């Protein structure tokens, strides 16, 4: 079959390209170790997903035999544990390391890189037992040494280990290692390791709904600002979800919009869908109409269509429509992770209406407002308007003597003393950008 | 006239969606389709319309007869004469494609036109082919094909245009009116209202000018439009025979609102049963209502709702309801005061609007700067 | 039609006469500068994306 020969040729080409690339990342690691410049290791992490799957088990075994020519204890211990391949006559002699290069032991950076590559390979293989064992061995190998350069790849190593363990539903088991390793990173101040470790520690509670624990771990912990964009986006998403479930809404919405903007524009379709969905529910709960622009995006269309229906129903303020939409889409809502806040909406609907009325009018007779918001009582209207003022959604003082509902006054602080405070934040941020730019000029 | 009739297209829509307008236009459309043997479209036309009648055979017999005649003629010419390129053989089979478009379906016509394009060696004879293809695409309302064809014709080939672009302007405008993009392209692309070619796609010069005036009003309520439409030479000249359109435009301009509202009602009714009713039926009406209220509100600071209602005739309660909804929408700066039935015009002043624009522009630029800075310094 | 500067308050049946504050060029120049910097930011974005 010519198809089999073509596939074998393609696999051989991919393996050769991958060996060349692995040599390139090894050279990058050597340069970063020599010059204390982890920029190359950041590049390797950035391009790490691209090299997820281009080899085979036998190719990996031959590569490891050729590379770890040094009498490395890690390879010595790992080889017997690896399943012994069947006797094969075809064994290419791959000896890139000769003389000084061969004598020099292979760096733990390279060892971890190759190990995590095997992790990705047998991960797509879904080889959970060996994944876990290899992760544990990697954990011991990292713990033996205390070099910062290792953590650069070790962070994604932990990430992949956690992802493997999630399938096994062993989060309650991982938590111990996660907490301990976070403590160690904190005692060493490893920025990226800390970022990923905090992220996964939060993710555990999020899936297990230990929200009080999550609040503890978010408030008491400290997130360094120099973290990566992706980890920042994850942190913002999880924090936004926690706050939104926590009945605090303004900060949650602000943070969620900031994260969504920070999130990749074209990648992470599902994750972007989830973040948009949580932000949509939060906004609707906070009595603000969302942006209709999103609900037409092709990238996030069908995962939201139920939410488009929900937002239209809430705006129209039709109880029958809201009940029917819930009755039709409760299962999807549960699946998404928004049932609690939607149950909150199911009685908080009238807040959006009070906000819209108090924003469109400037003085409404209380009987008129009662007729507007279908309450059937001036007393009920008075209570509701007092509630609107209390919650801080409207800024009108109710005068229960002439049915007045007096809105705000004439020109506000936003033309008297507000613009200066507004400009101060902008100027601080711009100067900060400039200072970071100048201080990040160059090494040589 | 030329090309499958956009008039037939409008009749199709009528016997279509309009659920009360199926009385006599149905008869006209049926008896006009029966002539000329458009079996392909007639299939779906009968599927949507009344069950059937025993005429499909009595038409398609001779339809296939003429198809076979043309095919035999052009094929015999091609076989006899080995002439290639711009040969009478190509003329003939392009004529066959013309008949195929005129009577048969969309897929066959498109295949025929694609086949005949490859032989084109005349830029004009290819521009006209693209015009035909876009006409068919508009007839069948295929947005993707329309956009691809329009962009191709405009860009790849529009270099030696012997002032055929006027036609391309009109087709661009038809497209951008089908799309709800009524303002920028729809307004500017009616600068060529001096159209010597009473185009086929144009139902008539009267309909062209009516569309021009409607789109002009929607895109420019009174933003110094008078220099283009109110004083428009040819615009007025044609307008003199369109009393309804003259009433509507001059009512919005001269500030005679009691009649502007009736004009808008009639315009909405008329646009309902039109091939551009999907993107306007309520959007255009709402925008025009908003612009009328905004124009009246300007020049004033406090207006008693009695006065506003009277200017609009009467309907004080309706004025409150509409004003409330529109202000809530996020436009039409004003704040109602129910307890006294007075409105207030809280328009931001020059400095306020300038600063509220600078703050947001700066917000966008700073976010961009931060993202770039993060991208660098990996 | 901007024949003259003023405003009408139907509430009191009173016509108000005044002038429009002219000194505003600062913000217009600033907004133009902001747009120019937006174009330059797009350009630098392009340079960075083309070359890492």
């Amino acid at each position: 079959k010519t198809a089999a020969a073509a596939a074998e040729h393609s696999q051989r080409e991919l393996d050769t390209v991958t060996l060349e690339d692995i040599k390139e990342h090894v050279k990058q690691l050597e340069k970063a170790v020599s010059g204390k410049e982890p920029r190359f290791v950041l590049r390797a992490l950035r391009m790490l997903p691209s090299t997820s799957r281009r080899l085979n088990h036998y190719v990996l075994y031959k590569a490891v035999q050729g590379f770890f020519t040094s009498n490395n204890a890690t390879r010595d211990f790992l080889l017997p544990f690896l399943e012994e391949p069947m006797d094969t006559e075809a064994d290419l002699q791959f000896r890139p390391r000769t003389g000084k290069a061969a004598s020099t032991p292979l760096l733990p950076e390279v060892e971890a890189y190759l190990q995590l590559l095997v992790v990705i390979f047998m991960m797509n293989s879904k080889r959970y037992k060996e994944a876990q064992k290899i992760s544990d061995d990697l954990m011991q190998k990292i713990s033996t040494q205390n070099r910062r350069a290792l953590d650069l790849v070790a962070a994604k190593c932990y990430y992949y280990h956690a992802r493997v363990y999630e399938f096994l539903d062993k989060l309650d088991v991982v938590r111990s290692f996660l907490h301990a390793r976070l403590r160690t990173a904190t005692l060493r101040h490893d920025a990226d390791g800390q970022a990923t470790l905090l992220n996964l520690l939060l993710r555990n509670y999020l899936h297990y709904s230990l929200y009080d624990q999550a609040e503890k771990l978010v408030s008491k912990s400290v997130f360094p600002e120099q973290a990566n964009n992706n980890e920042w986006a994850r942190y913002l998403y999880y924090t936004g979800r926690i706050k939104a479930i926590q009945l605090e809404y303004s900060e949650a919405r602000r943070t969620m919009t900031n994260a969504l903007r920070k999130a990749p524009q074209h990648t992470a379709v599902g994750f972007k869908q989830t973040v948009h969905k949580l932000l949509i529910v939060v906004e609707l709960l906070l009595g603000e109409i969302p942006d209709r622009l999103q609900f037409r995006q092709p990238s996030l269309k069908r995962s939201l269509m139920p939410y488009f229906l929900l937002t239209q129903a809430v705006r129209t303020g039709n109880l029958a429509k809201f009940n029917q939409v819930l009755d039709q889409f409760g299962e999807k809502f549960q699946a998404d992770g928004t049932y609690t806040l939607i149950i909150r909406l199911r009685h908080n609907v009238i807040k959006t209406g009070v906000r819209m009325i108090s924003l469109s009018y400037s003085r409404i007779s209380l009987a008129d407002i009662a007729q507007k918001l279908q309450l059937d009582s001036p007393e009920d209207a008075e209570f509701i308007v007092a509630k609107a003022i209390r919650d801080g959604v409207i800024e009108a003082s109710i005068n229960h003597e002439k049915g007045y509902v007096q809105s705000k006054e004439m020109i506000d602080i936003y033309s008297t003393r507000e613009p200066q405070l507004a400009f101060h934040q902008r100027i601080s941020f711009c100067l900060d950008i400039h200072n970071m730019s100048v201080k990040a000029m160059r090494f040589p | 006239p030329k090309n499958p009739d956009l008039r037939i297209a409008q009749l199709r829509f009528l016997l279509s969606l309009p659920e009360h307008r199926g009385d006599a236009a149905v008869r006209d459309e049926l008896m006009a389709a029966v002539r000329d043997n458009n079996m392909a479209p007639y299939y779906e036309a009968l599927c949507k319309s009344l069950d059937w009648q025993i005429d499909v055979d009595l038409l398609n017999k001779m339809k296939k007869a003429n198809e076979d005649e043309l095919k035999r003629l052009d094929e015999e010419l091609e076989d006899a004469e080995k002439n290639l390129g711009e040969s009478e053989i190509r003329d003939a089979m392009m004529a066959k494609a013309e008949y195929l478009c005129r009577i048969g379906d969309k897929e066959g016509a498109l295949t025929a036109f694609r086949k005949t394009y490859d032989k084109t060696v005349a830029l004009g004879h290819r521009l006209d082919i693209v015009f035909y293809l876009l006409r068919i695409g508009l007839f069948y309302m295929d947005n993707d094909l329309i956009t691809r064809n329009t962009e191709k014709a405009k860009s790849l080939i529009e270099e030696g245009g012997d002032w055929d672009r006027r036609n391309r302007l009109k087709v661009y405008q038809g497209l951008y009116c089908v799309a709800i993009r009524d303002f920028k392209q729809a307004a500017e692309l009616f600068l060529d209202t001096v159209s010597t070619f009473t185009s086929y796609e144009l139902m008539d010069y009267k309909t062209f000018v009516t569309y021009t005036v409607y789109v002009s009003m929607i895109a420019l309520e009174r933003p110094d439009l008078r220099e283009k439409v109110i004083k428009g030479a040819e615009i007025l000249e044609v307008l003199h025979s369109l009393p309804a359109v003259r009433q509507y435009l001059f009512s919005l301009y001269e500030c005679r609102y009691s009649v502007f509202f009736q004009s808008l009602a009639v315009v909405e009714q008329e646009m309902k049963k039109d091939w551009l009713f999907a993107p306007h039926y309520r959007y255009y009406v709402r925008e025009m209502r908003i612009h009328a209220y905004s124009q009246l509100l300007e020049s004033y600071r406090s207006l008693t709702l009695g006065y506003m209602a009277e200017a609009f005739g009467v309907g004080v309660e309706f004025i409150d309801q509409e004003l409330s909804r529109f202000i809530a929408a996020g436009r039409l700066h004003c704040k109602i005061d129910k307890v006294n039935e007075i409105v207030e015009t809280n328009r931001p002043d020059s400095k306020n609007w300038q600063y509220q624009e600078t703050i947001k522009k700066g917000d966008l630029l700073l976010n961009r700067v931060q993202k770039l800075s993060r991208v660098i310094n990996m | 039609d901007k024949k003259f500067h003023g405003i009408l308050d139907q509430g009191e049946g009173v016509l108000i006469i005044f002038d429009e504050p002219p000194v505003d060029k600062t913000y217009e120049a600033a907004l133009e500068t902001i747009q120019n910097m937006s174009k330059v930011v797009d350009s630098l974005y392009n340079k960075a994306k083309k070359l890492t």
Partner: peptide, 30 residues
């Protein structure tokens, strides 16, 4: 706003060019 924006953009461009030049030089050295 104006001064901070101008200086920020200028500094970003200067860093961009300096890093590009030094990276190309180091890559080409060996």
């Amino acid at each position: 706003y104006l001064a901070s924006l101008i200086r920020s953009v200028v500094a970003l461009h200067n860093l961009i060019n300096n890093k590009i030049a030094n990276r190309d030089a180091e890559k080409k050295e060996g």
